[PDB]
mmCIF file of C-alpha atoms and ligand atoms in Angstrom:
data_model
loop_
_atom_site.group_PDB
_atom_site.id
_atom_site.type_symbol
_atom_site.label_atom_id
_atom_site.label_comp_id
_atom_site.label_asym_id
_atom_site.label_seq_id
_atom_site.Cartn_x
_atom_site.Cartn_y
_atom_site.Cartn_z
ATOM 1 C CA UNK A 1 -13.245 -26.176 5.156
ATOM 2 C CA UNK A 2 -15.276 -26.355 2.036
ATOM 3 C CA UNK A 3 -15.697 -23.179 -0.224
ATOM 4 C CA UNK A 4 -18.016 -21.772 -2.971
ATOM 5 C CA UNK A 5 -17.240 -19.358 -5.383
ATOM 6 C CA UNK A 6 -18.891 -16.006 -4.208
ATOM 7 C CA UNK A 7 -18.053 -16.964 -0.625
ATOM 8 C CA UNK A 8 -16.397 -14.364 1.411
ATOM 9 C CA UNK A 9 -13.114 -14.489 4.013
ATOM 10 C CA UNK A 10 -13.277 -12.270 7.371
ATOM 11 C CA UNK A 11 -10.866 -11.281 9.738
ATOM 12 C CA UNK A 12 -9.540 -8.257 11.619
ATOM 13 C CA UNK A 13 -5.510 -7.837 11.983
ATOM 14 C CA UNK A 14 -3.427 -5.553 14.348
ATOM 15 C CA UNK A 15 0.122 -6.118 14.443
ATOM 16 C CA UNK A 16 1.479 -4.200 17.209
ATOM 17 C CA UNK A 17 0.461 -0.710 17.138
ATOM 18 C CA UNK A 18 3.102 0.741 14.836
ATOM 19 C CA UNK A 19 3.153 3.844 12.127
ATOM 20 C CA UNK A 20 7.025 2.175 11.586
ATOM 21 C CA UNK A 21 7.085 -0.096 9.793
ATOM 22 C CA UNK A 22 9.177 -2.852 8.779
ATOM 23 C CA UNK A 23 10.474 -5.131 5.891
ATOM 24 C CA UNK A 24 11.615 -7.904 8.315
ATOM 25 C CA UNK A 25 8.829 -9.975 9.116
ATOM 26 C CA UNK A 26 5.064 -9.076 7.217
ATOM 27 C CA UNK A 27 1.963 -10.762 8.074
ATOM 28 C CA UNK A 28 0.968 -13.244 4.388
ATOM 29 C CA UNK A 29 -2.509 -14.558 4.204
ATOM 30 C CA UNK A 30 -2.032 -17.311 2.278
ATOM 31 C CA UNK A 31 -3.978 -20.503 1.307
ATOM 32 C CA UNK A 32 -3.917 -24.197 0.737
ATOM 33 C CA UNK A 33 -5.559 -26.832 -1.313
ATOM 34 C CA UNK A 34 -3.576 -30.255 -0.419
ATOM 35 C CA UNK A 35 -3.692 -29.231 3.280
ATOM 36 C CA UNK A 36 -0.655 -28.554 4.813
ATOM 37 C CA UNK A 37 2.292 -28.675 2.170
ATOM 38 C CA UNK A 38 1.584 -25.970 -0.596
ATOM 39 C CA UNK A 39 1.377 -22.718 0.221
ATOM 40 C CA UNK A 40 -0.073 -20.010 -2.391
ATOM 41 C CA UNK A 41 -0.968 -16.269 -1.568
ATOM 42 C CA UNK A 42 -4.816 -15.895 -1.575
ATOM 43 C CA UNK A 43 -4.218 -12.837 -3.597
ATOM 44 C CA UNK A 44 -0.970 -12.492 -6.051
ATOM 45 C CA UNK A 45 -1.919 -9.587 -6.399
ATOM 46 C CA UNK A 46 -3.573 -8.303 -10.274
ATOM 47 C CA UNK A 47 -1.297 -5.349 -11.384
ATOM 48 C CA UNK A 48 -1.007 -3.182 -14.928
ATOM 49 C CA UNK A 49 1.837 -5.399 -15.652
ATOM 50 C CA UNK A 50 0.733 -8.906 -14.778
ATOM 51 C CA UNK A 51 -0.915 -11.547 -17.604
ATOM 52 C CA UNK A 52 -1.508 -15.118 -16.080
ATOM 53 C CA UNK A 53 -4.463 -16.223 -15.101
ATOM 54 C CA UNK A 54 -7.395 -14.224 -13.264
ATOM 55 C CA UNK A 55 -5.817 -11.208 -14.202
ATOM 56 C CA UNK A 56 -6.025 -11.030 -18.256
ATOM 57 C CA UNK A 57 -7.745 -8.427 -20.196
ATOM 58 C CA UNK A 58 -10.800 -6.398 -20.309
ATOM 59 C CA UNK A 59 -12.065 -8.254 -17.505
ATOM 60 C CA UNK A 60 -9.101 -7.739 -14.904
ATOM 61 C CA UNK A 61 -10.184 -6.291 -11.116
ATOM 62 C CA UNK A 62 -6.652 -4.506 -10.312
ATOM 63 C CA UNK A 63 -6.051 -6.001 -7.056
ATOM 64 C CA UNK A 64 -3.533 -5.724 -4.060
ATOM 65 C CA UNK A 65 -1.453 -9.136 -2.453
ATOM 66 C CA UNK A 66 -2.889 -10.702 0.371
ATOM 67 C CA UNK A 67 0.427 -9.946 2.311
ATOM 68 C CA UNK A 68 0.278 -7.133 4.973
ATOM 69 C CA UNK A 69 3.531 -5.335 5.955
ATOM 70 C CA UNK A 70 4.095 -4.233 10.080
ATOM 71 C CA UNK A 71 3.384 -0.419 10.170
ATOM 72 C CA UNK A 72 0.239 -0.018 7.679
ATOM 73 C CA UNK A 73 -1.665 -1.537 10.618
ATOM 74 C CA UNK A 74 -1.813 1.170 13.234
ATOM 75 C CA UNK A 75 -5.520 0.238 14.894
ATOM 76 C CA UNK A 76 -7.946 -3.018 14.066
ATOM 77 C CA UNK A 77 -8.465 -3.523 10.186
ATOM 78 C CA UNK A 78 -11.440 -5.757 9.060
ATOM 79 C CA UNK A 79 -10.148 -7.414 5.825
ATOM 80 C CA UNK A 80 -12.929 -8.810 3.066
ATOM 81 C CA UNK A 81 -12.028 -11.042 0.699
ATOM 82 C CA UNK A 82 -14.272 -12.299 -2.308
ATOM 83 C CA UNK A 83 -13.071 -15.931 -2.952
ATOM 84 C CA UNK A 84 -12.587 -16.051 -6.728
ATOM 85 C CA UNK A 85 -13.806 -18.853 -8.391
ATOM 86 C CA UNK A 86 -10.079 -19.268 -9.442
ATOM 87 C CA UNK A 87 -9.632 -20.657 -5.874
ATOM 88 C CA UNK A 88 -12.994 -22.011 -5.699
ATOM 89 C CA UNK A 89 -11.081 -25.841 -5.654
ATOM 90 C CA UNK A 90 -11.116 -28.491 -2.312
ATOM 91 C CA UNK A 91 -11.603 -27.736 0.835
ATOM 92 C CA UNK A 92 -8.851 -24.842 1.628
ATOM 93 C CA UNK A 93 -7.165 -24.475 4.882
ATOM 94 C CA UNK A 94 -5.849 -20.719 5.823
ATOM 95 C CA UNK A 95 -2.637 -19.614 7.396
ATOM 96 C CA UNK A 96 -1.369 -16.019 8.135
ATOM 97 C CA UNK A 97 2.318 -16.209 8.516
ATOM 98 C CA UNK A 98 4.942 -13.774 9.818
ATOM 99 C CA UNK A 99 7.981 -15.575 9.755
ATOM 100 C CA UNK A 100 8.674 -9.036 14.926
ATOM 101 C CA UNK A 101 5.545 -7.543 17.079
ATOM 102 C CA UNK A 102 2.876 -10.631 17.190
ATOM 103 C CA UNK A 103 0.009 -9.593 15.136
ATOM 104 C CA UNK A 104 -3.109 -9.261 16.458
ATOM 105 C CA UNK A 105 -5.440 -11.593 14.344
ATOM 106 C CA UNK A 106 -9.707 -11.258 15.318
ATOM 107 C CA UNK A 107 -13.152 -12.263 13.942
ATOM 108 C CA UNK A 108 -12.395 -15.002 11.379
ATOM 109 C CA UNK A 109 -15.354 -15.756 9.646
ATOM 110 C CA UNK A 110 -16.007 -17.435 6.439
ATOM 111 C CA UNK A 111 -19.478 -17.245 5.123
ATOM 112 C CA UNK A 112 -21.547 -18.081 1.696
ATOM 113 C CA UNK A 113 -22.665 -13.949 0.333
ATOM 114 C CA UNK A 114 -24.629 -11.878 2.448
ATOM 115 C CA UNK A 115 -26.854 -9.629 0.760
ATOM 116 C CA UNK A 116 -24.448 -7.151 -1.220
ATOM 117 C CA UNK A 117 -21.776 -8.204 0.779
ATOM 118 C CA UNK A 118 -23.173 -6.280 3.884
ATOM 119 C CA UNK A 119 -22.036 -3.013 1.622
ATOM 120 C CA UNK A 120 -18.698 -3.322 3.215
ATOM 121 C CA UNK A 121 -20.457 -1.972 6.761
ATOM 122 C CA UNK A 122 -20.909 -5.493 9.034
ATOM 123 C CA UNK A 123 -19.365 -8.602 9.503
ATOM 124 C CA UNK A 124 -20.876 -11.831 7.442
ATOM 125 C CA UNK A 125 -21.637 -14.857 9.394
ATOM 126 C CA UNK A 126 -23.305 -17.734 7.692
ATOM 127 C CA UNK A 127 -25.214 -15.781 5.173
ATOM 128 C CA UNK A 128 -26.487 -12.823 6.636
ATOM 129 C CA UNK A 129 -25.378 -9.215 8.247
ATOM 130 C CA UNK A 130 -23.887 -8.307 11.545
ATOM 131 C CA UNK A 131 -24.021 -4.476 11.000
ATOM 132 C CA UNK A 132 -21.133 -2.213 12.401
ATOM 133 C CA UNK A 133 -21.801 0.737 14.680
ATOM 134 C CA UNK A 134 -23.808 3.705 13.011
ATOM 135 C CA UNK A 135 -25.113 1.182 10.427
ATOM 136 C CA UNK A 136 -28.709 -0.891 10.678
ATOM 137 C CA UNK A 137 -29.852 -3.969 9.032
ATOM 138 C CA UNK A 138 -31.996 -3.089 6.127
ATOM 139 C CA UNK A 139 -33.214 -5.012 3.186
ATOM 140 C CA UNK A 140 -30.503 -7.815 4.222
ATOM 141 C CA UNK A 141 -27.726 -5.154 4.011
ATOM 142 C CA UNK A 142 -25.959 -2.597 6.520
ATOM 143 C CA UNK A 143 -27.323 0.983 5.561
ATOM 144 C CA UNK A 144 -25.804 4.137 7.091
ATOM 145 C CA UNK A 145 -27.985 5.584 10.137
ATOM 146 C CA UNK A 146 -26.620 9.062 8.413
ATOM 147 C CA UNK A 147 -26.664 9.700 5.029
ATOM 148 C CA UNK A 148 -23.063 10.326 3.511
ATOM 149 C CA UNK A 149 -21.297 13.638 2.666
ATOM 150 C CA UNK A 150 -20.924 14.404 -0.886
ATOM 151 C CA UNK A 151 -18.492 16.521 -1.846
ATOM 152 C CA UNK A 152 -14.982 16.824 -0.742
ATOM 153 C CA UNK A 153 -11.989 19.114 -1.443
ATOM 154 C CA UNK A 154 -8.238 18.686 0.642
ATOM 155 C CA UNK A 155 -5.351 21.420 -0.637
ATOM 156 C CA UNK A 156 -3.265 19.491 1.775
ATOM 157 C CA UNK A 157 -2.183 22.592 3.421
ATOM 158 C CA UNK A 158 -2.334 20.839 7.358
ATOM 159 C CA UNK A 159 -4.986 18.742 8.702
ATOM 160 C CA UNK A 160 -6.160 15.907 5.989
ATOM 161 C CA UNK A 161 -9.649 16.029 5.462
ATOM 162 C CA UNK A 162 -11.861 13.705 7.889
ATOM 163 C CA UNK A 163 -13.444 12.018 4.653
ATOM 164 C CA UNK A 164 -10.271 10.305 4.117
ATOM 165 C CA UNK A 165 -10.612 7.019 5.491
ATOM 166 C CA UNK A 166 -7.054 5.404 5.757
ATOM 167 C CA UNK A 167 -4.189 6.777 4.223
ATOM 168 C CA UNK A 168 -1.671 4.372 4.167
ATOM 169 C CA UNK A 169 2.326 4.828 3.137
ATOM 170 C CA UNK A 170 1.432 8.616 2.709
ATOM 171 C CA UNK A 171 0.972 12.008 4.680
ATOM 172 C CA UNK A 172 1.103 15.754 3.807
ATOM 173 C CA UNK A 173 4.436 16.410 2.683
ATOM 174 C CA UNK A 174 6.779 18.314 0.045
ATOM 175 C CA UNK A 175 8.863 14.995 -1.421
ATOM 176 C CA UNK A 176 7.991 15.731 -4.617
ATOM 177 C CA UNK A 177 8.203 19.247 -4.979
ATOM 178 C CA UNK A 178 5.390 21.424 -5.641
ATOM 179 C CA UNK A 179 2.351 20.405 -7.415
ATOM 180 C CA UNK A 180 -0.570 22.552 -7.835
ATOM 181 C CA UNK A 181 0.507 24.977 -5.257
ATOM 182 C CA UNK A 182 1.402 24.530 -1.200
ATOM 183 C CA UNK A 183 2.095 21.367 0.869
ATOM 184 C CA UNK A 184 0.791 17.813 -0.829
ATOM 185 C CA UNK A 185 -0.551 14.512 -0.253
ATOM 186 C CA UNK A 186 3.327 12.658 -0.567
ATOM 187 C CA UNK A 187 3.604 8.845 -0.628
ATOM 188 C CA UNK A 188 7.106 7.486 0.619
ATOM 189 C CA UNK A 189 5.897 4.281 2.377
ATOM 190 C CA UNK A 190 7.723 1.344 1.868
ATOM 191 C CA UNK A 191 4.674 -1.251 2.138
ATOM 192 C CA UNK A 192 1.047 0.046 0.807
ATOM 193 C CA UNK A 193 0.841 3.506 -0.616
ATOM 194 C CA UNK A 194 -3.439 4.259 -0.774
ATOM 195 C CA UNK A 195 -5.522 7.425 -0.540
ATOM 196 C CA UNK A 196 -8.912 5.895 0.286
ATOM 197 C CA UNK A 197 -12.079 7.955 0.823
ATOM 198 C CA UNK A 198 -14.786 7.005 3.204
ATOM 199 C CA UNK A 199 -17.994 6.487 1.505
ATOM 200 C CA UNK A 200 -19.266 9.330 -0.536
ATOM 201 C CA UNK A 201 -23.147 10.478 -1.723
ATOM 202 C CA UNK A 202 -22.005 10.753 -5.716
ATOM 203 C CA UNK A 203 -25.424 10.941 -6.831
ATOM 204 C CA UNK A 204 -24.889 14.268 -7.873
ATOM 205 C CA UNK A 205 -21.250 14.326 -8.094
ATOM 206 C CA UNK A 206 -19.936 15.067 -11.777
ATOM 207 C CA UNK A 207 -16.319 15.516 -11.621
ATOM 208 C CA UNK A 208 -13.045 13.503 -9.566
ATOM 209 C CA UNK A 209 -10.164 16.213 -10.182
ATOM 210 C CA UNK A 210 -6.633 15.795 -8.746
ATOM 211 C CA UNK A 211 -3.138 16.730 -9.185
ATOM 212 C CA UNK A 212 -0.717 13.865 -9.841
ATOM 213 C CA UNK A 213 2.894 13.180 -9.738
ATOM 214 C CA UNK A 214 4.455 10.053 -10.560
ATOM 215 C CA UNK A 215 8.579 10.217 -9.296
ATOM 216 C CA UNK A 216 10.737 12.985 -10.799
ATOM 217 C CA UNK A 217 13.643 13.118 -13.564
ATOM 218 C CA UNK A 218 15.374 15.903 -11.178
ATOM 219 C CA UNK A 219 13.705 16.196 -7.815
ATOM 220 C CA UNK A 220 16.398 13.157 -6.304
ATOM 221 C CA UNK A 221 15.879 10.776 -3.752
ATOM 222 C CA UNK A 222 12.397 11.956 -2.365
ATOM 223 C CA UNK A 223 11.178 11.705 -5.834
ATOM 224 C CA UNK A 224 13.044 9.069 -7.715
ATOM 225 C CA UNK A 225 12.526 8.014 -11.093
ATOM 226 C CA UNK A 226 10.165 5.110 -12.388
ATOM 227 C CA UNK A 227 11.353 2.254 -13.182
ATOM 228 C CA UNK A 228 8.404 -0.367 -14.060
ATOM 229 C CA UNK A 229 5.155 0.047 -15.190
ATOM 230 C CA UNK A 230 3.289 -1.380 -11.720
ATOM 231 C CA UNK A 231 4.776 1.923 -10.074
ATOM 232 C CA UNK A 232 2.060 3.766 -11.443
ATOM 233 C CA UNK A 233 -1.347 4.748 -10.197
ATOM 234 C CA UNK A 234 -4.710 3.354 -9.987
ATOM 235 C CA UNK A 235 -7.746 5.034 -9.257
ATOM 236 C CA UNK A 236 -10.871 2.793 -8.558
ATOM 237 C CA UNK A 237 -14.447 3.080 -6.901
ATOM 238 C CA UNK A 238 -15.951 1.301 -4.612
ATOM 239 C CA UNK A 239 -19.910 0.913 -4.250
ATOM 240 C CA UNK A 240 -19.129 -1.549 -1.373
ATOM 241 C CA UNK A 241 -16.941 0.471 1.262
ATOM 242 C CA UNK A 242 -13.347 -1.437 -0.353
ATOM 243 C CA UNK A 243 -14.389 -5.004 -0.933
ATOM 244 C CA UNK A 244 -15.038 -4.481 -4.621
ATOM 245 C CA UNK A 245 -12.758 -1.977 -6.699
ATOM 246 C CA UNK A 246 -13.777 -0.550 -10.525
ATOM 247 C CA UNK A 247 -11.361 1.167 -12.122
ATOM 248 C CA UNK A 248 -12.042 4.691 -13.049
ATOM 249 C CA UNK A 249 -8.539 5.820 -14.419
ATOM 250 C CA UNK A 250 -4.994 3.979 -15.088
ATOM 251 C CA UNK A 251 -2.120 6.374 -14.767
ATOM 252 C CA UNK A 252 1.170 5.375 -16.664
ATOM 253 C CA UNK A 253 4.151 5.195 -14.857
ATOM 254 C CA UNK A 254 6.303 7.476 -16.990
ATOM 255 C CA UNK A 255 3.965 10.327 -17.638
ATOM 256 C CA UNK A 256 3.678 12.168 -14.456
ATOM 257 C CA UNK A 257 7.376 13.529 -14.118
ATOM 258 C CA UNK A 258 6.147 16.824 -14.091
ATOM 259 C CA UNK A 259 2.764 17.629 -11.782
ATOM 260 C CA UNK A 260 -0.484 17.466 -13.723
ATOM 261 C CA UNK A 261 -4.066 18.143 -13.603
ATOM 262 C CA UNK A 262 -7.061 14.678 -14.143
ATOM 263 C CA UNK A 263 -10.390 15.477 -14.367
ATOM 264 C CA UNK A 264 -12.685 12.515 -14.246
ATOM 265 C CA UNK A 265 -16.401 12.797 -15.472
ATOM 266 C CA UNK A 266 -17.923 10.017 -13.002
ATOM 267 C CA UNK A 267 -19.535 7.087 -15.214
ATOM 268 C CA UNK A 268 -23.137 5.947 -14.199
ATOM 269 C CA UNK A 269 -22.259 2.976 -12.098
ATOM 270 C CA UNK A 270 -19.990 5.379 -9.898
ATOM 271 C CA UNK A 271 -22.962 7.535 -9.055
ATOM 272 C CA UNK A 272 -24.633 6.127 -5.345
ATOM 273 C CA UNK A 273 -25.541 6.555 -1.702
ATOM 274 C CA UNK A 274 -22.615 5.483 -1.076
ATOM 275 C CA UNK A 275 -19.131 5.250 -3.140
ATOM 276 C CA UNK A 276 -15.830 5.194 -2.146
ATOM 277 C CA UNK A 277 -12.744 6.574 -4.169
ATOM 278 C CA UNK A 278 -9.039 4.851 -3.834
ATOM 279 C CA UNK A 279 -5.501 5.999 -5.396
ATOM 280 C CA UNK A 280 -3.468 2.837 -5.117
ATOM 281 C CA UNK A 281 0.024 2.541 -6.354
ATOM 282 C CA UNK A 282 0.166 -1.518 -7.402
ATOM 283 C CA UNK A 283 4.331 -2.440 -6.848
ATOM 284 C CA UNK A 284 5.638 -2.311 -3.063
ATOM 285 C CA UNK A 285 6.630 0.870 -1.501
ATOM 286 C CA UNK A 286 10.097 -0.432 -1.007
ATOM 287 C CA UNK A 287 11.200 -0.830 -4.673
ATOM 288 C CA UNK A 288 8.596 2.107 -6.112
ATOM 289 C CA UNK A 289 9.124 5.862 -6.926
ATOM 290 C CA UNK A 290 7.085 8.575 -4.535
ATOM 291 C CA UNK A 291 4.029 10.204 -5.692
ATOM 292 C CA UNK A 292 2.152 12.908 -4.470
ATOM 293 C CA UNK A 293 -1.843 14.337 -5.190
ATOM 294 C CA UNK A 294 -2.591 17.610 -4.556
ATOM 295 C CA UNK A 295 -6.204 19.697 -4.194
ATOM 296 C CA UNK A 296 -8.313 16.611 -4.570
ATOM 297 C CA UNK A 297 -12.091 17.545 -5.570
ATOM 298 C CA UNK A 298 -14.709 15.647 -5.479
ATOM 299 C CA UNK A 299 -17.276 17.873 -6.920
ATOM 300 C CA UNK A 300 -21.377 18.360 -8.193
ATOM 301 C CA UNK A 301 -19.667 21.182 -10.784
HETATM 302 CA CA1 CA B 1 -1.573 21.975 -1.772
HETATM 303 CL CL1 CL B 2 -4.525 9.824 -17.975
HETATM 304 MG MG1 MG B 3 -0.695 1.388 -19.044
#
């Protein structure tokens, strides 16, 4: 099929109803160009360390691989992917590999934009919205038939907050020791490790505070040591519900041995009806030190 720039890829994957997960056989959405022979990633994946092309500079969207590992994929995930004008060649043909549950594949639909992308709330076919359930059409967009909390606050003392989305390669835990005080948020998965909010009324909302730890010099094998620089953290906002990230803070990889308090003042652009928050750690879970968060705020001061 032939593909524009600001078009948009669809789909909805389930691989077999596992939290376990494993390294044997992951589900890669990749792409090709000469039809059959070549086979690229759709997304390498744009990470702190990485400077080819599309991912250089001051204009860089840090950016997970298009590669989806068996136990991050409990229920149905809808996956949307802006086609960079990077791959923006001849007509592309998809394939999504796995090389072992069969994964569940759904609703593959490849579209020019919808208006703003349907705000990450319906699917896109052929140019306009197909809104989700609680969402309406409205001004060629899916709008929330509720409007959205605002402010949030998990100690991580028991039951995770219900304005946490998906957490992924993560769960309240201890692996890294204490960090403000109590039970954390503790990421030990081996494929994605995110903390991803749903979307949030930030308006109002001044200040993103957090706890972070990044590994341990002395904590041991819950808590390892870094070792490269895409092990640390990136925290990004989404005014789209996940299909477009901004960053709002890099964390280095080295300088959260010890826990330690970030308070973010919220730039303009983060401030909405309805923006999401993520803590993404770029490398693999497999090959990447533990982290933990602890009394995340989200907060009109
Ligand atoms: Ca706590
Ligand atoms: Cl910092
Ligand atoms: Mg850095």
């Amino acid at each position: 099929l032939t593909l524009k720039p600001g078009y948009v890829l669809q789909f909805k994957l389930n691989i077999g109803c596992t939290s376990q997960f494993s390294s044997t056989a992951p589900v890669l959405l990749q792409y090709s160009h000469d039809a059959g022979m070549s086979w690229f990633l759709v997304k390498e994946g744009c990470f702190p360390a990485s400077a080819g092309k599309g991912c250089e500079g001051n204009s860089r969207e840090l950016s997970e691989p298009t590669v989806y590992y068996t136990g991050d994929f409990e229920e149905w995930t809808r996956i949307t992917i802006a086609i960079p004008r990077s791959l923006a060649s001849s007509k592309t043909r998809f394939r999504w590999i796995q090389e072992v549950p069969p994964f569940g594949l759904d609703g593959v639909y490849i579209s020019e934009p919808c208006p703003s992308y349907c705000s990450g709330h319906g699917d896109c076919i052929s140019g306009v919205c197909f809104c989700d359930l609680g969402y309406t059409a409205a001004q060629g967009t899916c709008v929330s038939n509720t409007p959205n909390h605002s402010e949030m606050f998990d100690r991580f003392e028991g039951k995770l907050s219900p304005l946490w989305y998906k957490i992924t390669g993560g769960q309240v835990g201890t692996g890294c020791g204490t960090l403000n005080d109590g039970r954390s948020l503790y990421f030990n998965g081996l494929g994605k490790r995110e903390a991803r909010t749903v979307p949030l009324d930030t308006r109002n909302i001044r200040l993103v505070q957090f706890y972070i730890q990044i590994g341990s010099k002395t904590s041991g094998i819950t808590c390892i040591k870094p070792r490269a620089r895409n092990e640390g953290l990136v925290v990004q906002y989404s005014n789209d519900n996940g299909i477009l990230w901004h960053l709002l803070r890099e964390l280095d990889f080295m300088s959260f041995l010890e826990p330690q308090i970030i308070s973010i003042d919220l730039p303009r652009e983060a401030k909405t009806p309805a923006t999401a928050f993520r803590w993404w750690q770029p490398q693999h879970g497999k090959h990447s030190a533990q982290w933990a968060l602890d009394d995340v705020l989200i907060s009109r001061l």
